[PDB]
Amino acid sequence: TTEENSKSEALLDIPMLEQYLELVGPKLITDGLAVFEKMMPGYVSVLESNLTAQDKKGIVEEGHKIKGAAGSVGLRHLQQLGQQIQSPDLPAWEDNVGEWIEEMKEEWRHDVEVLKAWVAKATKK
**In sequence order, what DSSP letters do the residues of 30-97 get, joined into one string?**
HHHHHHHHHHHHHHHHHHHHHHHHT-HHHHHHHHHHHHHHHHHTT-HHHHHHHHHHT-TTSTTHHHHH
Whether the CA torsion 38, 108, 120, 32 is positive or negative: it is negative
Experimental method of this PDB entry: NMR
Domains present along the chain, CATH in parentheses: 1-125 (1.20.120.160)
C-alpha separations of 4 from 32, 79, 107 in Å = 30, 22, 18
The 10 Å CB-count burial string (b at 16+, else e) for 12-22 is bbeebbeebbe
d(CA 109, CA 53): 26
Under 8 Å CB-to-CB from 29, ≥6 apart: which residues?
17, 20, 21, 73, 74, 115, 116, 119
What is the phi-psi region of residue 5: left when phi exceeds 0, alpha when psi lies from -120 to 50, beta otherwise?
Answer: beta
C-alpha separations of 98 from 23, 57, 88, 102 in Å = 39, 16, 12, 6
Rg for the chain (alpha carbons), in Å? 15
d(CA 22, CA 36): 21
Whether the CA torsion 61, 64, 66, 72 is positive or negative: it is negative
Degrees (nearest 5) of the Cα angle 78, 42, 33?
A: 50
Please check whether residue 59 is in contact with residue 50, taking contact to mean a CB–CB distance below 8 angstroms: yes
Q: Which uninterrupted H or E stretch holds 26? A: helix 26-53
Among residues 11, 9, 37, which one has the least CA distance to residue 110? 11
Contacts within 8 Å (CB) and 24+ apart, 51-54: 51/101
